[PDB]
Structure formats: structure tokens, C-alpha cells
């Protein structure tokens, strides 16, 4: 009945985890000093919830799986494991070591069949087995009814889902980080509760953001480069850092998982789909998607995000490789701190005064990390000024001033308070959805040797 | 079950050690007044962790070993001991004395075989034995599956790892000091928790750094030297001082162990490798490396360091041999002190006022060592000034001012706050990897005599 | 198991002794009012430690021995006792009186053999006995494996060690005062914890140092001496005063025991040696040296000293024989007092204000002796001023100003704070190492008479 998580017993993150999973009993049990403990704990509880919701005797496809995590489960899993990332050969070896070390000791699980399944694929790397295959999400031929994506960011969502549906899959799950900051087109940001920072490739030489490195210099003037950049806008390449682990991502694929509430898949076969968010905790979400045959209803093309805590996006000034520039940064703010600044923001406040007030509220144990305070104080100061300016320029009801050209005002801060919602327009009608092993002889030999005894 | 460390029972370092090794029970037991006790305690616990992680019945290679430390272990070690440093003949003699004094009293360990192995090498200094050899890491011929580097700074990392891999090694470990300050190209620095200071060879005659010596003088003017230095930049030679022990190092070899998360080794045989940091405590780290046959995935070439406490690098002014100069210095700062200065650094503060505030926070028992306070106060003062200057020179969004030449600003301080990450670009594709005994007759005779009874 | 020392039970020096020897149990037992009690207690515990570290059944050479101290030991000692100092005939008589008064009452020790050994030497003053001889460290012919130097300052270290190594000695120990202040070339200094003061011969007529004497005078003007001194620099001759005992020393021989960590001895036979400091307590140290045959590794030539408390060296003004001059003085400062002055020294302070603050911290029982306070207060005041001047003359990074001749600044104070290290360059490659009884008939007759009954 209880669930054990590898976190410290005095951690403040334990209370937030309990609030997000009211149907479990969470107990701390620390064994390792892993620096991504909070992120791993959330994903561990997410899989437990999914298994409870679905019924036994169901076949589940695990896309981009790590087979060692499913070894001690009593459900039927079919692991789809292509070898496309540099961390994959190590995961395969860890799978074989755990299997051989448990043979003859665990009897409830189908240990013998799993070992037999692995050997068959090694001899002929083209056969489908009940528990293992070497194909991709498009070229796999096994039929099931449930599909699971756990921390997968490298596929195009409408294309991948369509190939799952024509094989009889009616339910899908997606676990990962929130995609909202990438719909606002920010240049850098943070997930402070999970010790996570990300940044665009062009600003990796900044000075005062979470993920950067710079140098000491005296300051020259020439730097004669005739070719002009003249413009600095976000590009596709993005670097992620969870704890001390680095992951490169792509903006196009990240935004493709920001699906609307209702959409249609039109091809040789047609489907009507629905997307819903069931769990949310300070940047991690769980999504649930259903698919049914036929075309019903109509679509609007809107996606909605509910904010339990504050969300900020502001303009900041920094030096990149010694040159002063400006770009945008986003972050999350705890709800208690947001509610205690309502009275202060009724008037204009300087950034220096806001910083001192935030320190007093925080260090009263820290509610929020201290390295994000300076940019939050700057954002709050500009938001109050812009609100004050609006009240002093009252317009008339039901008219638009166009004396024909209109002026556009300047906006430096976007602040979504708790209990508010964001809404964006995306595509909702899809009608376009258009193999080698990759294993080497030395790797196949090594896997066989570990399995023998 | 408990682990004993040779430190004082009232030491404040005991709490930090407990937090870094949650899977053990640490108990103090002081027997000697060793002045490098904290450094020795970390290395003692690191080896215990490694043995627990790996499975028995495995062959382990100990590169650059001190065989006396492995004499009471129940695992199979193969010590690779060339004689290339002046401290090696003493280590060999200590090994023989401990073996002869334990013969006939310890039976669990393979004492008799170890004595027999040592005698065979003395007669013919070219044979490989199960527990001992006189070759280097390149010319050894024994095959194993685990390799361990404990405080080894004298080898080129990609070259050494490649020769280990072609012999069947799949796992490697490296224990030593953090290499991050040498990637920032500092001239001097400190590791205050371990009583360690280091400096470049050119600044050994300074006045107010950790490792220096100078004289008294009245001040002359001529010093007529026509040849001009005209420039002062870091060189290859670096001196280390742990407690009262001196060690010379080389900058090129130190930086070669700052490996990226993913890299390839291309030669007659090809391998794909991964590097990860598992333990970190105030500048002391443990790294884990895996190697697999074949080429998979792609590489980016980025190395990431996670900061649990503050990291600083600043410009300082001193007199070297009576002449005033300027260079850079780095150090580490405890996290609690960093969090308590957030409010103060919101405005501009003089170096004198910052020093008095730091003393009040520290001496409230000392959290940090007092001899690094003056340079920390100066570094904090310049960081606050530069942040204020950036806020008063706001630019426009998405543009670069190039009215074509751009001006570069001056930077005097780099400050990495807790819960932030550094990132550097390094090489990740390697394709180039290109014997005598050294023992003397008098030394061989002495070893034989100690072994006889 | 316990060790007894002849010091007062309420002395504050007892705590420092316990910290330096954690492996013993120290108990006070006062029997005499000796004024060099602290220095004698340290040497007593040092010999006990050495006996524990080495194994029984080993032959030990005692260079420059006092044979009465080794009379009640159960180990095998070979006392090398030439008669070259005026205190030697008295030490020999004390040896004979104790032997005759213990015959027939002590049975565990080899009392009968020691008495027989003494008589043989008197008849023929050229024979080597297992426990006694009349030669020097160069002309002795006994072979052993351990050598001990206890408060010996009258030999050249590289020459003495070479003659010990060719006789089969592999380990050596040296006990004495710290040689660091003589590497800085000071004119006078103190060891306040041991009631020890030393001074150069040229300043024995000063007024306000530890070891001096002067007269009252009204002040004349002529003193017509055509020959000009014109210069005052340290010379070879130095006087020591431990308690109320006077010892003359030589600067050349004192500096020869400041050995580097690694050095080579090259001659007919070659050796590789290593030096290490194992005990340190407020200026009193124990050194351990090992020697092995052959040539291995390379040398740098650096010697390192670790400071557990503060070390000072400053400029002072005094009248010598009525004439005002200036010279340098060194001393030691307790660590607790050093840590409490960090805040004060952030700004400029006058010598008068510094003296009052030091008195308040000290007399709050005395942590430090009051007669050294005036020179410590003056040294602190000048150090703060010089640091302030450096901050106001900032230079540029990586360049040297030589507009070609450069100016040298004035330095009046050297301050080594606790947890710092000194480093000096010394010689590390040695290749040059190039008898009468002295007893009288009346002395031999007296020794024989005391032995008979
Ligand atoms: N087109 C595709 N179809 C199926 N799997 C793919 C794929 N492209 C990449 N992958 C796999 O998806 C994996 C993402 S890494 C995720 C591993 C695992 N889910 C975990 O939580 O640790 C990679 O190992 C890669 O091999
Ligand atoms: N190329 C090489 N291959 C293998 N060992 C080497 C080597 N170059 C130097 N060494 C050895 O590496 C040692 C480093 S000193 C480290 C000793 C031991 N690991 C300890 O913890 O104390 C030296 O003794 C030197 O003999
Ligand atoms: N060249 C030499 N070789 C051996 N002994 C010498 C020597 N020159 C001087 N000595 C002896 O060294 C002694 C130093 S006095 C030290 C005595 C004794 N170790 C103690 O602690 O009391 C002198 O008595 C002198 O006789
Ligand atoms: Mg990891
Ligand atoms: Mg040592
Ligand atoms: Mg006396
Ligand atoms: Zn499949
Ligand atoms: Zn070998
Ligand atoms: Zn002799």
C-alpha cells in the first residue's frame, strides 16, 4: 500500500508530492545522493498511478523504453527499443545484468521468458517477441491497447499517435516537463523545484543566468567584424540541464506536444481524439489521450493551461561574450509569496525596495531559491509601473482610436497570477503523416556472454 | 556495517561527510595527528562505495597503485606499479614489511600467494602475476573488467582509457580534486575545507595568497633589466600543497580529465563512452565511466558542472618580488553564507562594509576560514557594482547595437550561486592514441631480505 | 599506558600537549621547579612516540647521546658519545653514578652488560662495544638500521646522513626547534610558549627585546670613530636562551636541516631520500627521513611549512649601545587571537588603538605573554595600511608596467595567517661529502672509581 521514494526525510518537497497524489501513502527512504532526486520521484509515482487506472490483462507498448525499469512488474509490457542515442548501449547491458542475477530467485515474474526473448532477438535482429523488439514507433508490428511515453521528447506527436491508432490502441499517456514556456517563445528559463535550467545555444556565454559561463576581461573596442548579426531571436537548438545531466532538445518537437483539447486525425482511417491534464506539480505534468474511430463534432483550436502558482516572463539585460544585449527569461513563483505582495504592488516601487521585501518574506528555511530573486524583483517593479500608466490613460467605452493608424504600447512583463488561465491557438486538423537494425556484432556477443550464467 | 575515519570526534567536517554518503554509518576514531585527515577520510569512503557497487568475482586493475592499501581486501586486485616517482621505493618497502608481519596470523586473505608473487617479480622483472606487475598502464598485458584511478594526475585520459578498453574493461572510476577551476584559467586558488592551496610557478613570491613567501625591503627604483616581460599569463607548471605535502602538476593533463558527458574513441576498434559524476563534497569528486563497443548516437561536446555551494573568481592586486601586479584567484564559499547576503547585495556596498558584515555572520565556531574573507568581500563589492551598471543601460529587444564595431565591457568578477550550472565546450571525438624495468639490484636485494622471515 | 610529565597540574600548556599526542594519556606529576619544563616535556613524549612506531629487535644509533636517558629502556641502543662540549664530562659522570646505584636491584634491563661495556672502553679507548663508543658520527663503525638525533644542531645534515646510509640505516628521526625563522633571515625572535629567546651577537646591547642588556646614560655627541660600519646585517653567530640555559649556535648548520621533501645523495653509492614532518606544537617539530638505494624520479627543490597559528616578521626601531637603528624581529601568535582581529584590520588603525584591543582580548589568565604585545600591535598596524594602499593602485590584467625600469614598493611586515603555507627554494642534489680520543687519564681514573661498588 505505501510507496517509497528516494528523498531525504526532512525535505520540503515531500509535502507537495503528497498533495499531488492523494490516493497513495508516500514514505521517504534515502539510499543514494542523487542530485535529480525530485525529478525521479515524480516519475516513479506517475507510473504507479497509470497502472492503477488501467485494468490487468491489457497489453502495453512502452515507446523509447528503458527495459530495466519494467523488469519487476507483473503487467505485460512490450518494450520498443531502437538504438539511436549514445546512452542506449549502457541501458541494454544493465538490463542483462539484472536478469541473470535474478534467475532462480524470483518466480512470480516471467523471468525465464524474458531471458529467452532477449536471446532470440540477438540471433535474428528482425523478429517480434512478446516483450522485446528493436524497431521504432513507426515500424513496430505488435498490436496492443495502451501506449506509454515516459520522458520522450524526440518524436512528432500527431505522426506518432496516428501509427499507434491503426494498430488498435485506444489510450495513451505522456509524462514530462511543461511545454508552456516554449509557446511564449522565451530565450531562457528555470524549473527551480527540480534543479533544472535551460537556455538557447546563442546565450550560453552569458553572465547571470542559470546555465552559462563567461570570462574575465578588461574591455577592448575594435572587434572588427564587418558582417552584422543585427538581430537576436530564438533558434531551434536548446540545451537542458537536469541536476548535472545534459540533454539537447529541439523547439519544433517540444511544441508539437502542446495539443488542443479536441483534434482530428484524417487519413486512410479517421479518428477523433481528446487530450486532458490529470497531474500537475510545479512544472511536471501527466497527460491522457483517447482515440476513437470516426469523425464527430467540430474543433476550435485552443489549448488551455491552468496556473496553480505564479508564472512570470520578463525582459532582462546582460552581457554575452562581453557585449550588452537584452532578451527574455521565464520562471515559476510559489503561490504564498504571490499572495503576500498584493498590497505592495498597489503603488510604484523601485527594484531595490522590492528585493528587500522579498528577502524578508522568504527567509522567515527558504520558500524559494535565492538565485532567482533579483530577476523576480525587477519583473514586479515593471509590472506595477505599467498598470499605473494604464489607469491614467482612460479611453471611451466601445470605440477604438485610430487617428488610419494606431499606436502600440510597450510591454516588458507578463505575469499570470494563481487561479488564472492561458490560452493559445494551435492546429487541430491533421491530414499528413508521411528500417535498419543498427546493432553491431561486438555488442551482440557481449549481451550473450552476460546472459550465460 | 559502520565505517571508521581518523578524524576528531568534535570536527564540523563529520556532518558534511555523512550527507555525502547516506548509505553508511560514519564513526570517528582518532589515532594520529595527520594534517591531511579530511582528504584521507574522503578517499577511504570512496573505495568502500566502489566495492559495494560492483559484484564479487571481478578482476580489478589498480593503476598507479600503492599495494599496501589493498593488502587486507578480499577482492582480486592486480596492482600496476611502475617506479617513476621518488616516493615509490618507500611504498614498496612498506608493502613488504606489512606482508611479513602478517604471515601466519591472517588466513582469510591470500597472504601466502601475495608473498610468492612478490618474490617471483624480483627474480625476473618481466613476468605478469595475478596480483603484481612492474609495467605501466600501456604496456601491461593482464585482462580484467574494472579499472580504478585513485589520485592519479600524470596520464592523458583519452589515451589511457583506450588501452584499457581493448583488454575488455567495461567500467572505470576516477577519484580526485575538482578540475573546474583549471578550465576557467585561474592563476591561484584554494580548497579551504581540505587545507589545500595551489599556485602558478610565476607567483610563488607573492605576499597575500595561500602559498607564497616574500621578504622585507625599503624600495629601490632602478632594477635595470632591458628585456621586458610585458605580459603575465598562466603557464604549464603548477604547485600543489595538501596539508604540508608538496606535489607538482601539469595544466595540460589536469584539463584532460574534464570529459564531456558523451564521447567516441575511434581506432582499430571503436567504442562509445559516457561520463557521470556520482559524489561531490566541497571540491572532491568521484567519476564513473562506461565503455561499449560500436558507434552510436551523436556528440555535442559540452561538459556540465553543478554547484551545491558558491564558486568565485575575481581580480586581485598584489606585489610579486616587490612589484605591483594583478591576476585572478578562485575559491569556494559555503551555501548558508551565500544565502544570507542576498539582501545586502541589492545596492552598492564598499569593500570595508562588506568585510564587517561577513565577520558578524561567520563568528556567531567558524563556518568558513578567516584567511579568505578579505578577497571574498572585495569580490562581492565589485559584483554588486557591475549588476547596477547593467540595469541603467537598458537596450532594445532582439537587436544588437553595432554603430561595424561593437564595444566590450569590463568584467572583474564571476560568481556562480548555489543551484546553478557551468558549461564549457571541449573535444569529444578522439582518433589518435600514439619499456624498461627501472629496478636496481640493490633495491631488489633489500626487498628479498625483508620478505625472508 | 599513561605517560607522566613534570609540569604543574593547573598549567594551560597541558591541553596543547594532549592535542599533539592523541595516542597517549598525559598525566601531570610535578617534582622539580625546572624553568625549562615545557621544552623537556615535549622531548620526553617524542621519544615515546618513536619507540612505538618502530619494531623491537632493531638496533638504534643515538648520535650525540646522553647515555643516562637510555639507561632504563628495554630497546638496544648504541650511544655515540664524543667529548667535544664542556657539558660532556658531567653527563658521563651522571651515567656511572646511576649504573652503580642500580646494580643488583634492576633485573629486566641489561645493567650488568652496560657496566662491563663502560669498563672496557676506559682501558682501551678505541674499541666498539654494543652499547658505547667514543667516536663521532663519521668515524663510528657500528652497523644498525635506525638513527636518532635529539636536540643536535652541530652537524651538517647531508654529510651526516650519507655516512649513516652506507652502514645500512634506512630510517632517521630529528627532534628540535623549528628552522623556519632562520630561512627568513631575521635578526632576533622568540618562542613564547617555551620561554625561549634568541638574538644575533651584534644586537646583544639592545633595550626592548627578549635577550639584551644596556646601561643608563645622559647622551653625548662625539664618539669619534673614523672607521664606518655603514651596514648592519645578520652574521653567523647566534645565541640561544632556553629558560636560563645559554647555547651558542651557527646559522649555516641550522639552515642545513631545512630539507626539501625529496632529494638525492650521489657518491660511490647513490640514495633517494624523503623528508616529512609528523609532529608540530608551537615551534617544536619532529621530522622523519627515509633513505633507499638507487636514483628514482626528479627533484624540484622546494620546502613547505604549514602554519597552524600565526607567524609574524616586522621592522622595529631600538637603540643599540645608545645609537638608534632598525632591524627585523619574528614571533608566534595564537590562532584564537588572530581570528578575532579580522574585522578590526579591515580599516586603518593606529598602534595605540591596536594595543588596547589586544589587551582586552587577552586579559579576559593570559592567552599570550604580555611582553610581546607592543611589537605585535605595531606589526598589525602597518600590515593594514599596506593592504589599503594596494587596493587604491589597481593595475591591468595580464600586463607589467615597465616605463625599461620598474619601481619596487616598500614592505615592512610579513604576516602568515593560520591555515597558510610558506615555500622556499633550497638545494636538492648533493654530490660532495668531504680521529683522536680526547679523554684524559685523570677522567678515566675517576670513572673507574665510581663504577667499583
Ligand atoms: N523515432 C523513435 N521511435 C521510438 N523510439 C525512439 C525514437 N527516437 C528516439 N527513440 C528513443 O527514445 C529514447 C528517449 S531517452 C528515454 C529513455 C527512457 N524512456 C527513460 O525514461 O529513461 C532514446 O533512447 C531513443 O532510443
Ligand atoms: N604512465 C603511467 N602508468 C601507470 N602508472 C603511472 C604512470 N605514470 C606515473 N604512474 C604512477 O602513478 C603514481 C601516482 S602517485 C598515486 C599513488 C597511489 N594511487 C596513492 O593513492 O597514493 C606514481 O606512483 C607513479 O609511479
Ligand atoms: N660531529 C659530531 N658527531 C657526533 N656527536 C657530536 C658531534 N659534534 C658534537 N657532538 C655531540 O653532540 C652533543 C650535542 S648536546 C646534545 C646532548 C643530548 N642529545 C641531549 O639531549 O642532552 C654534544 O655533547 C657533542 O659532544
Ligand atoms: Mg544519473
Ligand atoms: Mg604524509
Ligand atoms: Mg638544566
Ligand atoms: Zn515491437
Ligand atoms: Zn600488469
Ligand atoms: Zn660506535
Author numbering:
A (entry chain L), B (entry chain A), C (entry chain B): 2 to 365, 376 to 414, 421 to 451, 456 to 474
Sentences from the paper on this structure:
Chikungunya virus (CHIKV) nonstructural protein 1 (nsP1) contains both the N7-guanine methyltransferase and guanylyltransferase activities and catalyzes the 5′ end cap formation of viral RNAs. To further understand its catalytic activity and role in virus–host interaction, we demonstrate that purified recombinant CHIKV nsP1 can reverse the guanylyl transfer reaction and remove the m7GMP from a variety of capped RNA substrates including host mRNAs.
To reveal the decapping mechanism of nsP1, we determined the capping/decapping inactive mutation H37A nsP1-mut in complex with SAH and mRNA analog, Cap-1 RNA m7GpppAmU at a resolution of 2.4 Å by cryo-EM. The guanine base, bound to the pocket formed by residues D152, Y154, Y248, and E250, forms stacking interactions with the aromatic side chain of Y154 and Y248 and is further stabled by a hydrogen bond (H-bond) with E250. The α- and β-phosphates interact with a magnesium ion, while the γ-phosphate indirectly interacts with a magnesium ion in a water-mediated manner. Compared to our reported structure of nsP1-mut in complex with Cap-0 RNA m7GpppAU-10 (12), the m7G0 cap and A1 of m7GpppAmU are located at a similar position. However, the U2 base is stacked to A1 instead of binding to the distant pocket for the uridine base on the opposite side and facing the periphery of the nsP1 upper ring.
